[PDB]
Amino acid sequence: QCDVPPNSRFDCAPDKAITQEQCEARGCCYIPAKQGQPWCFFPPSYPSYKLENLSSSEMGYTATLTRTTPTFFPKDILTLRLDVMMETENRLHFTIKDPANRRYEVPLAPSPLYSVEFSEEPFGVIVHRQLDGRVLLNTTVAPLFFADQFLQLSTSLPSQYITGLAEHLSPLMLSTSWTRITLWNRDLAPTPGANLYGSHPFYLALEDGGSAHGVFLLNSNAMDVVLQPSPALSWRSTGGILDVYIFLGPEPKSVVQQYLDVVGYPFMPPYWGLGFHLCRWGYSSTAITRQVVENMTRAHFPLDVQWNDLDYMDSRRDFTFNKDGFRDFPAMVQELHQGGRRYMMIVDPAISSSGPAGSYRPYDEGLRRGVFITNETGQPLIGKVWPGSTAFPDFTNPTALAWWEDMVAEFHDQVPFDGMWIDMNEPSNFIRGSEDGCPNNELENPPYVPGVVGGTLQAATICASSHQFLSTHYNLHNLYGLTEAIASHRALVKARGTRPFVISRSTFAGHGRYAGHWTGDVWSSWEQLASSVPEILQFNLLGVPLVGADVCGFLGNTSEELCVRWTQLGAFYPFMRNHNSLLSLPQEPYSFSEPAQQAMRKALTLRYALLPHLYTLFHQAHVAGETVARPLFLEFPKDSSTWTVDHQLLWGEALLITPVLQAGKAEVTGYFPLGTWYDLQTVPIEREPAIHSEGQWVTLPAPLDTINVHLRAGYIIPLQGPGLTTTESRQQPMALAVALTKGGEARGELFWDDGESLEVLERGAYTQVIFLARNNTIVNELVRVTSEGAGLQLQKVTVLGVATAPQQVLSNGVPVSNFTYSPDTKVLDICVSLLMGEQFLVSWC
Ligand SMILES: *[C@@H]1O[C@H](CO)[C@@H](O[C@@H]2O[C@H](CO)[C@@H](O[C@@H]3O[C@H](CO)[C@@H](O)[C@H](O)[C@@H]3O)[C@H](O)[C@H]2NC(C)=O)[C@H](O)[C@H]1NC(C)=O
Ligand SMILES: *[C@@H]1O[C@H](CO[C@@H]2O[C@@H](C)[C@@H](O)[C@@H](O)[C@@H]2O)[C@@H](O[C@@H]2O[C@H](CO)[C@@H](O)[C@H](O)[C@H]2NC(C)=O)[C@H](O)[C@H]1NC(C)=O
Ligand SMILES: *[C@@H]1O[C@H](CO)[C@@H](O[C@@H]2O[C@H](CO)[C@@H](O)[C@H](O)[C@H]2NC(C)=O)[C@H](O)[C@H]1NC(C)=O
Ligand SMILES: *[C@@H]1O[C@H](CO)[C@@H](O[C@@H]2O[C@H](CO)[C@@H](O)[C@H](O)[C@H]2NC(C)=O)[C@H](O)[C@H]1NC(C)=O
Ligand SMILES: *[C@@H]1O[C@H](CO[C@@H]2O[C@@H](C)[C@@H](O)[C@@H](O)[C@@H]2O)[C@@H](O)[C@H](O)[C@H]1NC(C)=O
Ligand SMILES: OCCN1C[C@H](O)[C@@H](O)[C@H](O)[C@H]1CO
Ligand SMILES: [Cl-]
Ligand SMILES: [Cl-]
Ligand SMILES: [Cl-]
């Protein structure tokens, strides 16, 4: 019975330290590890549920599951209902529910790629990949627990390679060495082993050969996910139901798209949101804040969006501004707009509750309309945050949504801010639970407490048993940030009538449909620079492509060298903002030495040149569930050498970025998949020219002023001329960079709209163009042309991998006014006068 291989032992004492006698009294095996691995584990005969009355419907299957021997947790639900729904050829969905009681649920050849079978006793669901018979899910490997406050469902994993389960500071590929991953949204500076600000109960598992599948557990309760080296995984949740989606891929990119089909495709940001953002805690007046913009401009640094932190508020209260340093706040923001820039400011969820009645409308009106989370006696739960005593809005309450909309619109009428930076929305609390503590009940003190920092669900947040419109906070806590993001998205649409721009700290699965994210209070360290790459990649896999870390780091003091490298890498975060803590030394680009400034300016210039391409990538994310920043393994999954690479990133399919992530380095070694990769430094923007890789690591020169960026052969990138804002840059002529395959082929595209309006795709108010290189010609193919985009000027075409000097270069049949060819770099640079929205033909020979 107890002869179970060490790596396949599932823990029978996850709840407490246990003796041999107690372990054996549970019906479990006790075998100490020889050096983590559980000492108390389930024998193969441990009582589980039994499958009964399996029946077939048009959807799939239904059955009853019966447990006859209780577990060691209280309130086993002895009779359950199983429902299996074969929803698409790629998506399998099953639920396990209590048929006697509605439990909490998170609010909202022709053949499938999967096949499903069931084990009868012990009960399990087994999902095969039909094409190769690989076992993807097999829940028979351990008992099913389903008690009121403890659900556990386990499965074998098809390999040691698994990614997902945000938010944690870790490699992109998670460790299967007895790792406990905790999902409970928590205000904590990112550090390993800890539950951070968000929770995404989704994983993508790679399979030998390069196929992959994904699993989403649609459950918002505090949970542990435990990975072990057999390899296997156990979901351990503290409430709700088991609601499981399996996505069959087979390509990792298809897995992600299929997942996003369920939770939502990324929202389309406004174009200006892709520009540079600059912020700190400590810009303590409008004068100082205006000087930031002046100082950036004077030193030729692009800046699209100026931000303020808590500084602007009156006594740290939402929807106010102080009349000392920020007396002329409205005028400052109007001026920013006149110069072609936008403005963002921090908003906290918590609302000051201590002011004299009638003196602070957000609280007074909130009270009148019953918008706040309430406690046992039905009053607002009062915590402590920046303004002092605060109540917490309940963003599951439709009346609170209406109130938030009003507060945002009213404040916007005073100061016309262009989006919302929503912070502290875990929700963070400076004290435990509330000013008045929390009651003693099973929600506050549950039978299984996941591995949360502080050892309690109340730590750094509000009472678990507090009341929200849809349910208790116990069930809804992990949705708090998401629900505020939805409320703010709608608020901004109503107040401004154009695309919302919301950047949120706390997130849950599906967040990306409404908003972006930044990774929080990262230290200004080389370690955190390096860690930002896997984290940015992870959030893209989870459908939140508008993600980045605070450039140069938030906590502590940056060094000049670190800030150069971080600006270089950060210029490839899809969301790029330099933000800085209150007590830190300044780290704006203009605050550094001239050479450092030059390097920071080059990084920003390159990003701005790439903005039409980055915007097109966001379009693909929004319309097709693509990633914007993506790991090498998503693009080359059949090359197993890519699987553990997470200190390089791609933008889309074609742009490979290999950053220096350590002090004192003048070179960097990165993986180059099979193909030709052209050095982007050979493309004129206002050392081998090509790496010919067999699939191999290559050491690259990387002096302090350089970040390595390579363009994949077979791809065409649209670029646009420079500006200190997108308002300026969007008016510039465009260019193409055309990276030829050895056979002379390349493809790419451009998506263009007005940069801001809602319902663009539905209304068809966009231009969409494909570019094709073939047989010494470049043409455009007009997928759609409208007023927005038709008149975009193409003035430069740069062709990489042209082996021999051309004798003539033609544009629409006529010799061009000017071209140059470099025999050393194999680059043909062509001046033209063409329009993106009209069919052209460029050729050479
Ligand atoms: C539910 O939340 C409400 C707040 O909305 C809590 O009300 C608080 O109740 C405590 C006593 O339990 C009050 O403290 C008392 O204050 C007076 C002077 O102000 C003092 O003389 C007493 O000795 C005591 O300290 C507190 O003022 C009150 N808070 C507010 C804002 O009125 C209520 O206790 C919560 N209920 C539960 C079960 O947690
Ligand atoms: C498994 O199902 C049997 C049969 O249930 C009946 O047929 C089903 C298709 C559906 O129409 C049910 O409503 C029917 O009751 C269950 O056995 C029956 O139990 C009922 C109630 O105890 C009893 O009146 C009948 O005599 C039983 N019929 C037979 C043929 O045995 C059985 O309880 C189900 N098992 C579980 C674990 O739920
Ligand atoms: C799913 O997992 C279960 C449990 O690990 C596997 O069932 C065991 O299979 C071995 C080898 O065939 C047998 O010796 C045991 O009797 C089985 N255990 C139980 C509890 O049934 C099963 O093979 C797996 N299924 C697939 C398709 O991989
Ligand atoms: C913007 O740049 C100006 C000019 O460099 C800064 O003004 C200087 O500030 C220092 C304090 O660090 C003073 O010692 C000097 O007297 C100032 N010089 C000049 C020419 O005015 C200013 O601090 C910068 N402001 C911001 C917000 O970065
Ligand atoms: C960050 O730096 C703060 C100020 O440092 C002081 O002034 C600068 C210009 C340097 O000369 C430095 O050597 C001085 O000590 C410190 O007060 C603060 O503690 C620093 N923070 C951390 C986390 O190191
Ligand atoms: O309690 C700190 C609250 N906020 C935490 C955010 O992560 C950080 O970016 C921000 O500067 C800070 C002040 O608003
Ligand atoms: Cl013992
Ligand atoms: Cl397949
Ligand atoms: Cl409920």
Coordinates of N, CA, C and O in Angstrom, one line a residue, residues 18 61 107 127 172-173 221 227 236 308 317 364 386 394 421 452 471 486 514 653 707 716 770 810 840:
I18 N 2.2 16.7 12.0 CA 1.5 15.5 12.3 C 2.5 14.4 12.7 O 3.6 14.4 12.3
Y61 N -21.2 15.3 -20.7 CA -21.5 14.3 -19.7 C -21.9 14.9 -18.4 O -21.6 16.1 -18.0
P107 N -18.2 35.9 -10.4 CA -19.2 36.5 -11.2 C -18.7 36.8 -12.6 O -17.6 37.0 -12.8
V127 N -7.7 13.5 -19.4 CA -7.8 14.1 -20.7 C -6.5 13.8 -21.6 O -5.4 14.1 -21.1
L172 N 10.3 32.4 -15.3 CA 9.1 32.2 -16.1 C 8.6 30.8 -16.0 O 7.4 30.5 -15.8
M173 N 9.5 29.8 -16.0 CA 9.2 28.4 -15.8 C 9.2 28.2 -14.3 O 10.2 28.4 -13.7
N221 N -11.0 32.2 -4.7 CA -10.7 32.1 -3.3 C -9.2 32.0 -3.0 O -8.5 31.7 -3.9
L227 N 3.3 22.2 -6.6 CA 3.9 21.6 -7.7 C 4.9 20.6 -7.1 O 5.7 20.9 -6.2
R236 N -5.4 23.8 -4.4 CA -5.9 23.7 -3.1 C -6.6 25.0 -2.8 O -5.9 26.0 -2.5
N308 N 1.3 62.4 -11.4 CA 1.6 62.7 -10.0 C 1.1 61.6 -9.1 O 0.1 60.9 -9.4
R317 N -6.4 62.7 0.2 CA -7.8 62.2 -0.1 C -8.1 62.2 -1.6 O -7.8 63.2 -2.3
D364 N -19.4 61.3 2.0 CA -20.8 61.7 2.3 C -21.8 61.0 1.4 O -22.8 60.4 1.8
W386 N -3.8 56.1 3.8 CA -3.1 57.4 3.7 C -3.8 58.6 4.3 O -3.2 59.3 5.0
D394 N -17.2 49.0 -2.4 CA -17.6 47.7 -2.8 C -17.9 47.7 -4.3 O -19.0 48.0 -4.7
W421 N -4.4 55.9 -12.4 CA -3.5 54.9 -11.8 C -4.1 54.4 -10.5 O -4.1 55.2 -9.5
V452 N 0.1 32.3 2.9 CA 0.1 33.8 2.8 C 1.1 34.4 3.7 O 1.3 34.0 4.8
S471 N -21.2 38.8 -2.4 CA -20.8 37.8 -1.5 C -19.9 38.4 -0.3 O -19.8 39.6 -0.2
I486 N -12.5 47.4 -13.7 CA -13.8 47.5 -14.5 C -14.6 48.8 -14.2 O -15.0 49.5 -15.1
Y514 N -9.6 45.1 -19.4 CA -10.0 46.4 -19.0 C -8.9 47.3 -18.7 O -9.0 48.5 -18.7
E653 N 6.6 38.5 -33.4 CA 7.4 37.4 -34.0 C 8.8 37.7 -34.3 O 9.6 36.8 -34.5
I707 N 21.9 48.5 -26.3 CA 21.1 47.2 -26.1 C 21.0 46.5 -27.4 O 20.7 47.1 -28.4
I716 N 8.8 42.4 -42.0 CA 8.8 43.9 -42.3 C 8.2 44.6 -41.1 O 7.1 44.3 -40.7
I770 N -0.8 45.4 -45.5 CA 0.2 44.3 -45.5 C 1.3 44.7 -46.4 O 1.1 45.3 -47.5
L810 N 13.8 51.3 -58.5 CA 12.6 52.0 -59.0 C 11.5 52.1 -58.0 O 11.4 51.2 -57.1
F840 N 1.6 50.6 -54.1 CA 2.9 50.9 -54.7 C 3.7 49.6 -55.0 O 3.4 48.5 -54.6

